[PDB]
Amino acid sequence: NYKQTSV
Amino acid sequence: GSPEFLGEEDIPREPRRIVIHRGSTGLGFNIVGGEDGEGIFISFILAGGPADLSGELRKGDQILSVNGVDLRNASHEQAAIALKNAGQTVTIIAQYKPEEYSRFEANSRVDSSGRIVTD
């Protein structure tokens, strides 16, 4: 785990 | 009269439908997950954003679907695309999964009411 996205 | 705190009450763990009307602005939350088919989880709700204003989403919610599109087994980038391109009316089915979520965030755990605590 690692990715992060603002939506 | 003795006060009644919401913090004692269990957070509901059944799936919920959330309809957000956000026009052409961001939804106002962050997602993590979608690597390993772990699921897509809310990691952060932006103050004042459409998701905040709904009052119906929180950190630790898994996004099960958006506008009928099943995201339980989505990849991270495709989940983000699904959300960003969902249109002005966004129908989310979410389910609170704090134990699963807690694996993402450092020093985080779940207390007896189901709340996510970070030490």
Distance of CA B68 to the CA centre of its chain: 16
Task: Provide, as residue numbers in chain B, all residues whose Cβ is less than 8 Å from the Cβ of A2.
Answer: 35
- Determine how β-strand A4-6 pairs with β-strand B29-33: antiparallel
Question: With an 8 Å Cβ cutoff, are B30 and A1 in contact?
Answer: no
Resolution in angstroms, to 1 decimal, for this deposition? 1.6
CA-wise closest residue to B53 among B21, B85, B83, B9 = B21
- Gap from B43 CA to chain A (nearest CA, Å): 8
Task: Provide, as residue numbers in chain B, all residues whose Cβ is less than 8 Å from the Cβ of A6.
Answer: 26, 29-30, 46
Question: With an 8 Å Cβ cutoff, are B83 and A1 in contact?
Answer: no
Please tell me the experimental approach by which this structure was elucidated. X-ray
Q: Which candidate from B26, B35, B46 shows the least CB-CB separation from A1?
A: B35
If you count DSSP H runs as helices and E runs as strands, how many of each does chain B have, helices first?
A: 3, 8
Q: Is CATH 3.30.750.24 the classification given to domain B1-119?
A: no
Task: Name B99's bridge partners.
Answer: none
Distance of CA B97 to the CA centre of its chain: 9
Task: Provide, as residue numbers in chain A, all residues whose Cβ is less than 8 Å from the Cβ of B90.
Answer: none
Q: How many whole angstroms separate alpha carbon B19 and alpha carbon B34? A: 22
